[PDB]
């Protein structure tokens, strides 16, 4: 079974089983087109494929661009096959992905990095078109080669940026994997410390903060507590402004909102 995948110039170890056809899933290695995400049995097949394949980026629309860094919005109804391949690809690095086959109700936000051969996949997140639970991310992943460089954070940030622009608040779909939780804590703490740094008033509601960041109140409260910034007193709750933490908090690993060009689908 699948231990490795060739992806562009990288050779990547898989963490988890993913349900590819047993035709493919009985091999040890799997050869992927880095641009259209077709999976193949051998180098020599991949090689002929790259000679035929016209794609140099993901389908859909490019809704963020800042130099070499893009995000594309791909509709799972319009690009059913690309989105499926991407879900299969992701299950190799997620313990549990809820859905693979049915990508129609999803939009896929594919972040890339451009070099002279094309726009290379850094990572993605999926979004329900219409979430009863107001989840603004279903699944998020940064590819192994790109992990721990700040990209996942840009992705998360970009999810809440779409939320601001839609005038919604959002949260990631429960349950969070452990790397997901570590990543969302770091993001949320940062959003909170940033907010308080710029805020000058003597009081705020959790709701105001939620309305401004598009972060969910329970996620805010939850982070305040992780930060031991929620205190109790008289018979009311106070927010403790930890300056040690704010100044702790002070490589182009940011999403710049003036580089978004988007209408909600």
């Amino acid at each position: 079974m699948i231990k490795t995948i060739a992806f562009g110039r990288y050779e990547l170890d898989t963490w988890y089983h993913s349900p590819y056809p047993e035709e493919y899933a009985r091999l040890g290695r799997l050869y992927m087109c880095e641009f259209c995400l077709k999976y193949m049995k051998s180098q020599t097949i991949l090689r002929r494929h790259m000679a035929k394949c016209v794609w140099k980026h993901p389908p859909g629309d490019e809704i963020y661009r800042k130099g070499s860094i893009s995000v594309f919005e791909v509709d799972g109804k319009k690009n059913k096959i690309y989105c499926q391949n991407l879900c299969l690809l992701a299950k190799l690095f997620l313990d549990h992905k809820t859905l693979y086959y049915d990508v129609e109700p999803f939009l896929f936000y594919v972040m890339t990095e451009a070099d002279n051969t094309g726009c290379h996949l850094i990572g993605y997140f999926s979004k329900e078109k219409n979430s009863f639970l107001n989840y603004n991310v279903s699944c998020i992943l940064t590819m192994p080669q790109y992990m721990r460089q700040g990209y996942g954070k840009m992705l998360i940030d970009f999810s809440y940026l779409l939320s601001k622009v839609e005038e919604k608040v959002g949260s990631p779909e429960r349950p969070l994997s452990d790397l997901g939780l570590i990543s969302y804590r770091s993001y949320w703490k940062e959003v909170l410390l940033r907010y308080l740094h710029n805020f000058q008033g003597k009081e705020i509601s959790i709701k105001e903060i939620s309305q401004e960041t598009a972060v969910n109140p329970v996620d805010i409260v939850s982070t305040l507590q992780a930060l031991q910034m929620l205190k109790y007193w008289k018979g009311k709750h106070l927010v403790l402004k930890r300056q040690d933490l704010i100044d702790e908090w002070i490589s182009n690993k940011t999403m710049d909102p003036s580089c978004l060009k988007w209408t909600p689908p």
């Binding site: 008033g201 509601s205 507590q225 709750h237």
Partner: peptide, 24 residues
């Protein structure tokens, strides 16, 4: 409203009430 624990105590907090931002 939302529930959690602080300094060994159960607490419950509003998300609409203004909370005193405080220092020491």
């Amino acid at each position: 409203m939302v529930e959690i624990e602080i300094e060994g105590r159960l607490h419950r907090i509003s998300i609409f009430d203004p909370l005193e931002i405080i220092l020491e």
